Amino acid sequence: AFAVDAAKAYKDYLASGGQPITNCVKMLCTHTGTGQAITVTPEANMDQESFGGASCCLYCRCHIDHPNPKGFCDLKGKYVQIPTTCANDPVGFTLKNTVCTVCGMWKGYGCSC
């Protein structure tokens, strides 16, 4: 009945004044893109930075299991768009926020639905 929760562990770490996870891989792009949250190629707009999906995944970076029966990762293999203001902690952003299902944008960021 015991499971290690990294999601809470990292969130509390940040609140403790902890230095966010670094060396996320930032991609060179046109920044003219659609601005969707998770895409097959970098989609960043002017307000976003495009990162490699795997490097922004807390579970990938910490070498631990993914929180789901299949153990599937929706980051690795893809590219994630982080708002330039939040770009200092890509791992924390993807962890804390959620992707809108219908319009594919970030909830609270760029989602007009």
Binding site: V25, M27, T41, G52, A54, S55, R61, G77
Partner: peptide, 17 residues
């Protein structure tokens, strides 16, 4: 040495989907 694959990321971007 950081534990990531920067080169792979660029390749995946560059190569066709």
């Amino acid at each position: 040495d950081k534990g990531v694959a920067p080169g792979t990321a660029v390749l995946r971007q560059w190569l066709p989907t």
